[PDB]
Structures are given as structure tokens and as C-alpha cells.
Design a binder for this molecule. Structure first.
Ligand code: NA
Ligand code: NA
Ligand code: NA
Length: 158
């Protein structure tokens, strides 16, 4: 009923490699809200802006008991370097095989260059404490985005 996206059951049990060397799973986040934001490339202008915007709002996400994960297909080492340089205090998922991206259907195609080109589309999702995807943002406009995600989270958490 309140879901806007249906994930395969196996998605919740995928081992997600994090910055810092640990793994998590979506099921492991049961009981609290989770924001999952997908971005195309570590250490690029839009991605950095977006990460810094979420980072600045962490205390507000904490007030709601929520956790945040950023996701791209960059390596763990790339993510470690990005987090250290920018001072991020939330983890980044190294989705090298795009398993998580595919589950959320964020790998989109564009007819360009006389080719069919596939890439990550900047997208964000709100996962409830019982693992339902209750809100989505696709083709994300970075300016104002983290603020909008926080506002939506607060509205839902009631
Ligand atoms: Na960086
Ligand atoms: Na959750
Ligand atoms: Na939406």
C-alpha cells in the first residue's frame, strides 16, 4: 500500500560494502528510517555538493533516528578518500557490481553518441523502519535536495 517501489526480497540481504571496510545490509537497518541517495561519481562537483549538503544536516536526521547512505559504483578506496577529504560522517556504499543500483532501478539508458549508454541517474529514496520504499526522487536537482528529503522524512516519520 504505501510503497512507491518494490524491491526483490534478496535486495535486503545483499552485502553492501562500505567506506571504512565493513559491510551492511538493508535488513540490518530494520527499526529505523534510512535515506539512500545514489550519485554518479565520487569527487565531482554535483556529487560533492550533494554529499556536503547531507553531511551538514546529519544532526537533523539524527533527531528523527534516521541513518543515511550514499551510493555510487566507485571503489571502497575511492569512497574512503572522498569521505576523508570532505569530512563526511555517514557511510558510502561501494556498489561496484551495481546490484543495489539495479534493485532501485537507477541505471538508466540514454540514446547518445549513436550508442545505448547506461549510467547511474541521481536518485534518492526513503526506506521506512519496516523496509518499505515510501518516497522516491529521480533525476535529482541537487540544489535544495537534502533539505527537501529531510522535510519529507519528518512528515513521514509522524
Ligand atoms: Na574528494
Ligand atoms: Na530501514
Ligand atoms: Na516522489
Amino acid at each position: 500500500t504505501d510503497a512507491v517501489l518494490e524491491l526483490p526480497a534478496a535486495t535486503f540481504d545483499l552485502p553492501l560494502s562500505l567506506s571504512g571496510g565493513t559491510q551492511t545490509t538493508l535488513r540490518a537497518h530494520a527499526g529505523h528510517w534510512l535515506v539512500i541517495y545514489f550519485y554518479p561519481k565520487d569527487s565531482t562537483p554535483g556529487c560533492t555538493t550533494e554529499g556536503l549538503d547531507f553531511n551538514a544536516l546529519l544532526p537533523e536526521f539524527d533527531k528523527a533516528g534516521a541513518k543515511i547512505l550514499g551510493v555510487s559504483r566507485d571503489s571502497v578506496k575511492s569512497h574512503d578518500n572522498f569521505c576523508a577529504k570532505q569530512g563526511f560522517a555517514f557511510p558510502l556504499v561501494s556498489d561496484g557490481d551495481e546490484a543495489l543500483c539495479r534493485a532501485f532501478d537507477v541505471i538508466k539508458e540514454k540514446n547518445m553518441y549513436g550508442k545505448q549508454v547506461l549510467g547511474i541517474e541521481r536518485s534518492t529514496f526513503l526506506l521506512s523502519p519496516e523496509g518499505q520504499v515510501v518516497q522516491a526522487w529521480r533525476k535529482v536537482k541537487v540544489a535544495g535536495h537534502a533539505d527537501a528529503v529531510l522535510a519529507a522524512l519528518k512528515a513521514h516519520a509522524k
